[PDB]
Write a protein that binds this ligand. Structure first.
Ligand code: HEC
Length: 124
């Protein structure tokens, strides 16, 4: 595990750098607000990455669609996550297109992947 996680980082980082020579590496201090910033959707409705994945992804989320239960999202915390890359290399763009209404920035992904592959301490 991680092999992919690390790849993504080294991936989304390259792409970004390929777009903005300024961006070279990610951080673990940006993957918070962006995931805790009550943003508005193009479908007239506010939401947040912490609306389902809670303020903390490593924690137990909850879908506001069915209201079942979304176990820890932390793809790193869980050994049964972030396995495939091909697929994952889309489900992330399709998501932002169904969350924000478009494809998230390449520098916003490597960021999340970082914080996701960084924080591994849940509350309870
Ligand atoms: C509820 C309406 C959600 C909000 C708000 C956001 N996401 Fe989400 N996410 C949601 C679901 C139903 C799923 C599928 C898995 C599950 O059990 O819920 C996901 C999955 C992700 C993933 C993993 C993708 C994969 O590895 O296949 C990521 C990385 C992810 N979500 C990130 C993410 C971000 C960045 C969000 C704000 C821009 C966000 N989610 C909001 C449901 C919901």
């Amino acid at each position: 595990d991680v092999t992919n996680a690390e790849k993504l980082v080294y991936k989304y980082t390259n792409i970004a750098h390929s777009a903005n020579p300024m961006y070279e590496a990610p951080s673990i201090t940006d993957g918070k607000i962006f995931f805790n910033r009550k943003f508005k959707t193009p479908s007239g409705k506010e939401a947040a990455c912490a609306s389902c994945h809670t303020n903390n992804p490593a924690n137990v989320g909850k879908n506001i669609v069915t209201g079942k239960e979304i176990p820890p999202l932390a793809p790193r915390v869980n050994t049964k996550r972030f396995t495939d890359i091909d697929k994952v290399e889309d489900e992330f763009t399709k998501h932002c297109n169904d969350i924000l209404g478009a494809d998230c920035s390449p520098s916003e992904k490597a960021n999340f992947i970082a914080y996701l592959l960084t924080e591994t301490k849940p509350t309870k």
